[PDB]
Design a binder for these strands. Sequence first.
DNA 1: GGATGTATATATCTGACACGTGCCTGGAGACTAGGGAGTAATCCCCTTGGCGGTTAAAACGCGGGGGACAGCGCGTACGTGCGTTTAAGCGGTTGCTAGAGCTGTCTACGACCAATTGAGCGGCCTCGGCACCGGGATTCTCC
DNA 2: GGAGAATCCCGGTGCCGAGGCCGCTCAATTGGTCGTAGACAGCTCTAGCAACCGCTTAAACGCACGTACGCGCTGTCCCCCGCGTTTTAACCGCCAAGGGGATTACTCCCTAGTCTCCAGGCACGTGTCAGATATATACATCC
Lengths: 97, 95, 105, 98, 96, 92, 85, 83
Amino acid sequence: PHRYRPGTVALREIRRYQKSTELLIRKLPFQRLVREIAQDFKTDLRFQSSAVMALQEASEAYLVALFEDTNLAAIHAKRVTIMPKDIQLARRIRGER
Amino acid sequence: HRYRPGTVAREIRRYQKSTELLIRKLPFQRLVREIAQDFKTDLRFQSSAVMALQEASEAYLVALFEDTNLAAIHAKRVTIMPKDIQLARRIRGER
Amino acid sequence: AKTRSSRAGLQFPVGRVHRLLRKGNYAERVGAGAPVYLAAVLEYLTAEILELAGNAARDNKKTRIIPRHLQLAVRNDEELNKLLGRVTIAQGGVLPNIQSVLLPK
Amino acid sequence: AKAKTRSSRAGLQFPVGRVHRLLRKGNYAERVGAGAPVYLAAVLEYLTAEILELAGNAARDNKKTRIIPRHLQLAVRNDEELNKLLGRVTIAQGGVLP
Amino acid sequence: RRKTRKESYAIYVYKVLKQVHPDTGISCKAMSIMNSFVNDVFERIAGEASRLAHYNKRSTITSREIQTAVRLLLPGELAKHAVSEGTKAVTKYTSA
Amino acid sequence: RKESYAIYVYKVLKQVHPDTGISCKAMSIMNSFVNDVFERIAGEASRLAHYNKRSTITSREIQTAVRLLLPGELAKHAVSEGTKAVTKYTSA
Amino acid sequence: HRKVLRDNIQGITKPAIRRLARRGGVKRISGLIYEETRGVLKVFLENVIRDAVTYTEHAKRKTVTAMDVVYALKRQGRTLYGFGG
Amino acid sequence: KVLRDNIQGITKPAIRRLARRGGVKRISGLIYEETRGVLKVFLENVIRDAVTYTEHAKRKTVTAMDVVYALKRQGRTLYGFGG
DNA sequence: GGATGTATATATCTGACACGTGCCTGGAGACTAGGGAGTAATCCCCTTGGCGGTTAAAACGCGGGGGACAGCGCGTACGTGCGTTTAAGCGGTTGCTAGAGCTGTCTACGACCAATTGAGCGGCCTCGGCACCGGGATTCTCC
DNA sequence: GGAGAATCCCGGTGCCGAGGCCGCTCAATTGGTCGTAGACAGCTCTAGCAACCGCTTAAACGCACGTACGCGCTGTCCCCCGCGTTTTAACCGCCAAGGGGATTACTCCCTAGTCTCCAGGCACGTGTCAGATATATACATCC
């Protein structure tokens, strides 16, 4: 049959998801995660829907910006595959961990 | 008698134990006056001001060299190269 | 009863800027020409960003500005990207940019 | 009656009256409560003591009887929470950690 | 009871837009983003001018403080065009 | 008449380490430190009072600013210290 | 008192992390990236939610609003436009 | 009088000492010009703000507090000169 | 095993640290008045919870190829040492200039009150933008 | 190079709900007045900044030699991607209930403002040792 070479689909998806603006994480799981994290600071809390949406926007922007630096580090090490050490180096040089 | 290349770099322990300024004072002061020449002519400086500038710039350079060394080790090298400085400055948010 | 924005030749409200300065706890007193200066600077920056946003909107065959166009306009400008370097624009996306090392040869 | 300072009432060393004056003359709000300067002075004194104890331990480790900026730098960078609080701060003549 | 009146810069941003692009519109989310931008820039400039006045032991925020804050905050040619716009506005306001 | 916190820093030092001095540069560093943390806490309390449409800065705003600014156990101990001080001051 | 949510970090599935990495311009991904990213996201959310709940409690409310999140983000150097303010 | 090649006054052994305090073992020969450029950019960014603060006060002498404020406004607080 | 940098002990000794004086400015005590804040009540909206369907995405397994990793060789560039050259640092001097403090003046800003017009909310419409479809065109992989 | 094929884009179609225009009301802005303190101008004066000079010596510079490391090539293998199939849960549209956040009105108490009075902190002046620099030395690191 027909099979695209490993990497064509990757570039196609990179273009596709860099052309759009919608949120890439599902909403119900993210909301459950947010409520679970919050139940450790105060019990019986309520959230406005816009609060959860603001949290999701901020989180996704943060993760995309982190992946850009992770890719930079992976390329610096003369690789195309990102590894956990690249994330660790990116967060270390930024000043987070 | 010759020490192996590497053993005399002792220097790391010597310069991480002390606290004094590593750049000389007259050249740094001349550089500061030359840089400030382009913002306003016939300026004056307190000695306190030049010492503050030198402290800040030396701290900045040491903190940058630490990240440069991290990048060099990430690339499986022991020598720092301009690409390491560039990667460090870019991930920080300066380039 | 002439307004101060019309005296200064502006669109933004000088009276509201003056009130916000007086009620923001910034100093004991507020000069007479500080609100005029600040309103002029705010209107200038607004016009600067809106012109680029509208150009980006027209480049995509659209007649309304949406957050994507604002993001494109801000990130494609060297000085606006530095003014807003630590700002996140909701529903703005990113700039299309693929590293040359990942392209096929 | 006899004038008792407001910091002796709270059992503090830091000046409560000076903190109240700096709050009033700093353009932070229209009014300043009566117990806000006391709370703030207590917090400042606590943080001062916390730094000074570690700096004195560092000074004694180096066979010194006098704190210099090196000891402050060591005390701050060897403590996790103090290093997190003063993360973007430069201490003059402090050096680095070996 | 009665809905409290909320204040924004929507009408002024719309006037500026109709000056720059006469035939272009704008959505609600983009107008909210523009409102946030205006508020953020206002707060930055005002805080910097406040610190400037406190440094020199002054009690009044004047247009000199605003100009110096604009020079400290805006980069490059943005600062030049902003100080020129502000100076022209103040001159026209005073000449009247 | 340049006011500083030098004498109160010295009084605290005499409590933690009765036999330990301090130099002029270290004392100026401590002065800068206390000024910096004062400015941080006061600015955060001012913003907290503005967000809630209040005119007064009270000990509650100071407590919330401390909980926002200090990390981990520093915040817990500072809150306990401040509360103890305000309680002692009131009933006296 | 509702129920106790548990094991919700696994709802951040692998395809979603792949989509985030694609928008980040990443071409190839190791299999150990997903747990690292889950941990990073958990730390980030913990910090922001801590600050937001602090604001909510100071205002003496029981509901977390969007302005609480906006203030929490702003005080960490991550300003967000589009949700009021 | 005008000043010239003062960035070359930041010698190579001084940069080597600054790197030693940073924990660096080997150093490429192309690091010195890169470091000089980085230092020049940093100094320009700080001195611009310091001279702005000085001009706003109608002064001709740059004081240490101007440098302190300039560093503080770009997130580089410095203790030890604020008095 | 010999070389060599490294911390340790003792003698010198001084300039910075800790302590004692006057005073004057800022903090404390007491009183007064008003507005900010807390309390109680009311109400509606928006948050939580549930059900049902439906369908698009997630999960899983298999095959395969390509990228990460290890090993080896090589040549270049960096380090090390030594001899020479340079300019920084230090201790003085002089001059003069600009920042600081004081005094007097007066203009610009806050406060209060009355008038009124601009801006925000509630309606009322209508077309840019989007989902869906068809056709053509485009990159992509195998021969 | 062709050539078949998933994949993407342009044109055209409905179709809607959000953007754009308008009326009414009221709260925020504007104009006028008066008082007063902050700011500005002028003068003095002294500390500290700039400039010069002479000398010492330590640090920078330049050159040569050797070797250790960065880089390139090759081979292996494992582990990530692509795809087809199955399974699951997100999402959308309802509905029902209630709690909590916003609003309004009232009371009252706490904070600013004023003035008086005193004491604590800050410059100035004074006496002493902690830590730096030297001289010598045993030792731990290195080749």
